[PDB]
Amino acid sequence: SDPLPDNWEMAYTEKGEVYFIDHNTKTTSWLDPRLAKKAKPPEECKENELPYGWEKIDDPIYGTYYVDHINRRTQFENPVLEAKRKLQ
């Protein structure tokens, strides 16, 4: 399974970072559409697991935070821990 979906391309930033180009909707995304996984409510994930689309970033200057590439959000709290906390 190498090919991208029809009417997609992939390209690279000057920093060598891959991203994906969707000509169907005239948008770009960091997410590889070939790698999409089933959505899961955050509270239903295991302790050391993140839902699909999330990335943990450890910034030397700004510390740890979480990035949601589906909704394009960033937050300090681990989203799985947050969901469990608010529902607990």
Partner: peptide, 13 residues
């Protein structure tokens, strides 16, 4: 206070 903002990929060309 907030974390670094979302950094988007290059815009669609």
């Amino acid at each position: 206070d907030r974390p670094p903002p979302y950094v988007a990929p290059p815009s669609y060309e």
